[PDB]
Tab-separated table of C-alpha atoms and ligand atoms in Angstrom:
chain	number	residue	atom	x	y	z
A	647	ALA	CA	112.577	77.893	64.888
A	648	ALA	CA	110.138	74.977	64.940
A	649	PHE	CA	112.180	72.599	67.083
A	650	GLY	CA	111.023	72.069	70.657
A	651	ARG	CA	107.750	73.916	70.335
A	652	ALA	CA	105.077	72.545	72.635
A	653	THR	CA	101.604	73.608	73.787
A	654	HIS	CA	100.627	70.723	76.073
A	655	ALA	CA	102.385	68.475	78.595
A	656	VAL	CA	100.915	65.150	79.589
A	657	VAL	CA	102.063	64.017	83.073
A	658	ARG	CA	100.849	61.495	85.571
A	659	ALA	CA	100.637	61.572	89.383
A	660	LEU	CA	102.820	59.191	91.108
A	661	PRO	CA	101.325	56.328	93.135
A	662	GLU	CA	102.213	55.603	96.725
A	663	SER	CA	103.025	52.043	95.623
A	664	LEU	CA	105.978	53.518	93.675
A	665	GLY	CA	108.232	53.613	96.725
A	666	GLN	CA	107.829	49.890	97.269
A	667	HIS	CA	106.991	48.197	93.945
A	668	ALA	CA	108.409	50.357	91.146
A	669	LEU	CA	110.931	48.551	88.953
A	670	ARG	CA	114.428	49.468	90.204
A	671	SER	CA	117.570	48.603	88.241
A	672	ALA	CA	120.056	49.617	90.984
A	673	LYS	CA	119.286	49.465	94.715
A	674	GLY	CA	120.213	52.135	97.239
A	675	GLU	CA	118.436	54.539	99.579
A	676	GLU	CA	114.698	53.984	99.716
A	677	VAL	CA	112.378	56.441	97.962
A	678	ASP	CA	110.897	59.210	100.098
A	679	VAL	CA	107.537	59.033	98.372
A	680	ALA	CA	106.272	62.257	99.942
A	681	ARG	CA	109.401	64.135	98.862
A	682	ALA	CA	109.166	62.602	95.378
A	683	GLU	CA	105.627	63.941	95.079
A	684	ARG	CA	106.930	67.388	96.019
A	685	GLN	CA	109.700	67.252	93.418
A	686	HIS	CA	107.180	66.069	90.849
A	687	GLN	CA	104.848	68.940	91.750
A	688	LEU	CA	107.687	71.418	91.317
A	689	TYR	CA	108.367	69.876	87.906
A	690	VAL	CA	104.749	70.151	86.796
A	691	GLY	CA	104.833	73.675	88.183
A	692	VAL	CA	107.686	74.611	85.834
A	693	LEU	CA	105.851	73.152	82.829
A	694	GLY	CA	102.471	74.712	83.528
A	695	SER	CA	102.769	77.608	85.980
A	696	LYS	CA	106.153	78.968	84.925
A	697	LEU	CA	106.190	78.080	81.209
A	698	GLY	CA	102.458	78.176	80.477
A	699	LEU	CA	101.914	74.769	78.878
A	700	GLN	CA	98.493	73.237	79.225
A	701	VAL	CA	99.196	70.358	81.602
A	702	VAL	CA	97.086	67.200	81.415
A	703	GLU	CA	97.660	65.403	84.739
A	704	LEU	CA	96.620	61.777	84.591
A	705	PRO	CA	95.586	60.269	87.942
A	706	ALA	CA	97.816	57.797	89.686
A	707	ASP	CA	97.025	54.087	89.471
A	708	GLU	CA	98.243	52.139	92.521
A	709	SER	CA	98.340	48.937	90.471
A	710	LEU	CA	100.885	50.507	88.073
A	711	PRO	CA	103.763	51.669	90.341
A	712	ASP	CA	105.729	53.190	87.436
A	713	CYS	CA	102.754	55.068	85.991
A	714	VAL	CA	104.507	58.422	86.628
A	715	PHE	CA	107.021	57.703	83.831
A	716	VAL	CA	104.671	58.563	80.973
A	717	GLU	CA	107.478	59.045	78.466
A	718	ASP	CA	107.916	55.285	78.122
A	719	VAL	CA	104.362	54.638	76.894
A	720	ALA	CA	103.928	57.323	74.255
A	721	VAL	CA	106.086	58.862	71.549
A	722	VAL	CA	104.544	61.946	69.956
A	723	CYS	CA	105.704	63.497	66.722
A	724	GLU	CA	103.673	66.387	65.341
A	725	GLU	CA	100.034	65.237	65.349
A	726	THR	CA	100.695	61.466	65.600
A	727	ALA	CA	101.124	59.451	68.790
A	728	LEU	CA	102.756	56.034	69.015
A	729	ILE	CA	101.373	54.284	72.075
A	730	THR	CA	104.160	51.862	72.826
A	731	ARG	CA	104.245	48.271	74.079
A	732	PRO	CA	106.613	48.714	77.043
A	733	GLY	CA	109.246	46.065	77.526
A	734	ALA	CA	108.254	45.518	81.163
A	735	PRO	CA	105.152	43.297	81.554
A	736	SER	CA	103.871	45.188	84.618
A	737	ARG	CA	103.752	48.504	82.740
A	738	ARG	CA	101.579	47.492	79.802
A	739	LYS	CA	98.254	48.710	81.198
A	740	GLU	CA	99.681	52.236	81.527
A	741	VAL	CA	98.708	52.770	77.887
A	742	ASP	CA	94.950	52.821	78.740
A	743	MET	CA	94.893	56.275	80.403
A	744	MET	CA	97.518	57.531	77.942
A	745	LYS	CA	95.380	56.422	74.984
A	746	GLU	CA	92.384	58.207	76.527
A	747	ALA	CA	94.253	61.438	77.189
A	748	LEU	CA	95.726	61.529	73.668
A	749	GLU	CA	92.338	60.744	72.124
A	750	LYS	CA	90.975	63.767	73.938
A	751	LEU	CA	93.816	65.810	72.471
A	752	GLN	CA	92.627	64.539	69.031
A	753	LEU	CA	95.972	62.991	68.036
A	754	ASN	CA	96.364	60.358	65.349
A	755	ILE	CA	96.871	57.296	67.569
A	756	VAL	CA	98.864	54.210	66.585
A	757	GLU	CA	99.024	51.401	69.129
A	758	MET	CA	102.008	49.011	69.067
A	759	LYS	CA	100.368	45.587	68.865
A	760	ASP	CA	102.962	43.082	67.502
A	761	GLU	CA	103.448	40.819	70.525
A	762	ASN	CA	107.044	40.298	69.363
A	763	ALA	CA	107.686	44.069	69.637
A	764	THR	CA	108.641	46.115	72.670
A	765	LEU	CA	109.571	49.766	72.891
A	766	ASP	CA	110.199	52.176	75.763
A	767	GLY	CA	109.881	55.850	74.869
A	768	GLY	CA	112.956	56.525	76.989
A	769	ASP	CA	114.945	54.707	74.291
A	770	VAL	CA	113.725	57.149	71.596
A	771	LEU	CA	115.712	60.285	70.809
A	772	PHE	CA	113.800	62.522	68.359
A	773	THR	CA	116.258	65.149	67.196
A	774	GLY	CA	113.781	67.239	65.180
A	775	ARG	CA	114.982	65.768	61.892
A	776	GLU	CA	115.287	62.040	62.664
A	777	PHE	CA	114.853	59.366	65.352
A	778	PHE	CA	117.507	57.356	67.112
A	779	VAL	CA	116.195	54.294	68.956
A	780	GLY	CA	118.268	52.418	71.495
A	781	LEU	CA	118.269	48.636	71.327
A	782	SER	CA	118.123	47.792	75.011
A	783	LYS	CA	116.627	45.432	77.562
A	784	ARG	CA	113.247	47.145	77.011
A	785	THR	CA	113.334	48.008	73.290
A	786	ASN	CA	114.012	45.489	70.500
A	787	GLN	CA	114.462	45.738	66.747
A	788	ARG	CA	110.796	44.963	66.087
A	789	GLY	CA	109.783	47.917	68.235
A	790	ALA	CA	112.095	50.183	66.248
A	791	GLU	CA	110.540	48.821	63.026
A	792	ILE	CA	107.075	49.824	64.199
A	793	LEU	CA	108.258	53.323	65.170
A	794	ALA	CA	109.764	53.730	61.726
A	795	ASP	CA	106.510	52.678	60.021
A	796	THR	CA	104.464	55.044	62.248
A	797	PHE	CA	106.619	58.136	61.584
A	798	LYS	CA	107.379	57.422	57.920
A	799	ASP	CA	108.339	61.072	57.388
A	800	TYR	CA	111.535	60.625	59.401
A	801	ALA	CA	114.599	58.445	59.192
A	802	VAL	CA	114.964	55.972	62.082
A	803	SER	CA	118.294	54.443	63.145
A	804	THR	CA	119.067	52.023	65.978
A	805	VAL	CA	121.797	52.306	68.590
A	806	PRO	CA	122.936	49.470	70.904
A	807	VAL	CA	122.520	50.336	74.614
A	808	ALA	CA	124.265	48.224	77.228
A	809	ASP	CA	123.655	47.293	80.853
A	810	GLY	CA	119.940	47.970	81.292
A	811	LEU	CA	120.322	51.621	80.323
A	812	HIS	CA	118.019	53.522	77.996
A	813	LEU	CA	119.313	55.653	75.121
A	814	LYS	CA	118.346	58.841	76.975
A	815	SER	CA	120.034	57.658	80.183
A	816	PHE	CA	123.014	59.583	78.785
A	817	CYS	CA	121.715	61.978	76.128
A	818	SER	CA	118.952	64.344	75.113
A	819	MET	CA	118.376	67.365	72.916
A	820	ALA	CA	119.618	70.601	74.454
A	821	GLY	CA	118.613	72.801	71.488
A	822	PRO	CA	118.154	72.778	67.735
A	823	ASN	CA	120.779	70.445	66.233
A	824	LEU	CA	122.413	70.152	69.672
A	825	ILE	CA	122.806	66.846	71.509
A	826	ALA	CA	123.687	66.894	75.201
A	827	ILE	CA	125.904	63.858	75.676
A	828	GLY	CA	127.574	62.129	78.623
A	829	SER	CA	131.299	61.616	78.808
A	830	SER	CA	131.297	57.888	79.551
A	831	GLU	CA	132.741	55.547	76.942
A	832	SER	CA	129.293	54.056	76.340
A	833	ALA	CA	127.762	57.513	75.882
A	834	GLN	CA	130.621	58.454	73.542
A	835	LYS	CA	130.290	55.285	71.475
A	836	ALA	CA	126.532	55.831	71.154
A	837	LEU	CA	127.099	59.365	69.907
A	838	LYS	CA	129.566	58.349	67.282
A	839	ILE	CA	127.131	55.678	66.066
A	840	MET	CA	124.394	58.339	65.794
A	841	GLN	CA	126.822	60.761	64.077
A	842	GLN	CA	127.888	58.201	61.483
A	843	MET	CA	124.270	57.183	60.676
A	844	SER	CA	122.865	60.685	60.314
A	845	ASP	CA	122.362	62.512	57.038
A	846	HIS	CA	124.531	65.289	58.524
A	847	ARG	CA	126.157	65.798	61.874
A	848	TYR	CA	124.909	67.346	65.101
A	849	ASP	CA	126.571	69.792	67.455
A	850	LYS	CA	127.127	68.362	70.931
A	851	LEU	CA	127.372	69.546	74.530
A	852	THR	CA	129.470	67.152	76.614
A	853	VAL	CA	128.556	66.976	80.310
A	854	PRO	CA	130.644	65.124	82.924
A	855	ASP	CA	127.758	63.160	84.482
A	856	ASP	CA	125.897	60.896	82.068
A	857	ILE	CA	122.644	61.226	83.990
A	858	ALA	CA	122.895	65.030	83.802
A	859	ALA	CA	122.857	64.797	79.964
A	860	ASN	CA	119.105	64.049	80.280
A	861	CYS	CA	117.450	67.455	80.130
A	862	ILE	CA	114.267	68.917	78.634
A	863	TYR	CA	114.459	71.526	75.881
A	864	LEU	CA	111.427	73.723	75.195
A	865	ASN	CA	110.845	76.493	72.683
A	866	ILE	CA	108.324	78.755	74.472
A	867	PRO	CA	107.642	81.671	72.101
A	868	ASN	CA	108.197	85.046	73.808
A	869	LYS	CA	109.672	83.439	76.912
A	870	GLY	CA	112.847	81.747	75.709
A	871	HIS	CA	114.710	78.718	74.550
A	872	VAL	CA	114.222	76.853	77.828
A	873	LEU	CA	116.356	74.002	79.224
A	874	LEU	CA	115.287	72.135	82.362
A	875	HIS	CA	118.458	70.499	83.742
A	876	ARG	CA	119.514	68.760	86.922
A	877	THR	CA	120.342	71.075	89.792
A	878	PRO	CA	123.810	72.270	90.887
A	879	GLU	CA	123.275	70.475	94.194
A	880	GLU	CA	122.646	67.175	92.363
A	881	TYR	CA	125.349	67.439	89.650
A	882	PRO	CA	127.397	70.618	90.176
A	883	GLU	CA	129.919	70.234	87.333
A	884	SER	CA	127.313	69.378	84.711
A	885	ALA	CA	125.142	72.315	85.785
A	886	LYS	CA	128.174	74.538	85.119
A	887	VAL	CA	128.438	73.241	81.539
A	888	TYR	CA	124.801	74.140	80.858
A	889	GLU	CA	125.574	77.660	82.083
A	890	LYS	CA	127.632	78.175	78.911
A	891	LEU	CA	124.277	78.319	76.991
A	892	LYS	CA	123.970	82.020	77.584
A	893	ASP	CA	121.054	82.302	75.130
A	894	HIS	CA	118.991	79.696	76.999
A	895	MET	CA	116.616	80.217	79.901
A	896	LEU	CA	118.180	77.684	82.263
A	897	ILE	CA	115.902	76.139	84.906
A	898	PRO	CA	117.344	73.745	87.513
A	899	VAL	CA	114.901	70.955	88.417
A	900	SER	CA	115.655	68.214	90.926
A	901	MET	CA	114.736	64.573	90.401
A	902	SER	CA	116.752	63.062	93.197
A	903	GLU	CA	114.022	60.835	94.681
A	904	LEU	CA	112.730	59.388	91.414
A	905	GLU	CA	116.286	58.920	90.145
A	906	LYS	CA	116.504	56.064	92.653
A	907	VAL	CA	113.997	54.175	90.449
A	908	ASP	CA	115.748	55.242	87.221
A	909	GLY	CA	113.497	58.284	86.710
A	910	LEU	CA	115.144	61.197	84.907
A	911	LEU	CA	113.812	64.461	83.669
A	912	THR	CA	112.471	63.416	80.228
A	913	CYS	CA	110.725	60.388	81.761
A	914	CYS	CA	108.023	62.414	83.520
A	915	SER	CA	106.303	64.180	80.651
A	916	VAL	CA	105.094	63.743	77.103
A	917	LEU	CA	105.256	67.053	75.246
A	918	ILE	CA	102.771	67.856	72.451
A	919	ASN	CA	102.512	70.743	69.982
A	920	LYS	CA	98.885	71.497	69.001
A	921	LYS	CA	98.410	74.014	66.225
B	1430	LIG	C1	115.130	58.290	79.984
B	1430	LIG	O1	115.074	56.964	80.459
B	1430	LIG	C2	115.910	56.787	81.589
B	1430	LIG	C3	115.589	55.430	82.223
B	1430	LIG	N1	114.243	55.363	82.810
B	1430	LIG	C4	113.142	55.617	81.897
B	1430	LIG	N2	113.336	54.976	80.827
B	1430	LIG	N3	111.937	55.056	82.507
B	1430	LIG	C5	111.839	55.297	83.940
B	1430	LIG	C6	112.189	54.073	84.786
B	1430	LIG	C7	110.982	53.128	84.955
B	1430	LIG	C8	111.394	51.893	85.785
B	1430	LIG	N4	111.412	52.205	87.200
């Protein structure tokens, strides 16, 4: 009932400098920055226009090429916001605008300040009853410690993440007590770690493409149990798996341009529930 409720979405415009200077783990086609802006506008359109969330759009900062990926700089649970200390040096000033937006939303703000701590919000899976935090190139144990202290109400457990991935590079919540999970060995080992550490186990939805396991679940009262998932023209066989959720309002949303710079669906928004 309560899980996935949101009233506000914080997003951030992307900068033109993204196409050229955004951190990129794997190299391939270049980014069509104009097209990426169109896909990002369609995505904000789903959140605000279609689903009715109050969207706070932060302006783009050319000096922060990754500023569109707001998920990495803030983790919000109930009324408290953890402003993170991103692993990547170039991203650290992205917290300034985030701090200001969340102040305006009157959230309890905690700023990660231990200079031995790093945490990327994309490494944080909040399941509704606990947190899993990936230990990765961007998030270390000290960062997980600070998250645990900030959200003392919830258990926090760490999961090793290999190869410059983030935890949510291959998983996300697809519904109450339901983890969407990739089929790779790494994704499957991560899940069994999470399952063994939890108080009690989660249901799972296995999708063939790891990247397609990153989706956005929203409880919009009197609209539906909404899932934004990658399109059938991006990942056809994963999209078909999501179709089995006959009780969900399924919304295909493309992220094909920003995926080139490791940008998935959860990365582009911070969802908040204001009562
Ligand atoms: C859900 O996370 C998937 C991986 N990317 C997230 N973490 N940040 C976006 C990439 C920023 C660097 N260009």
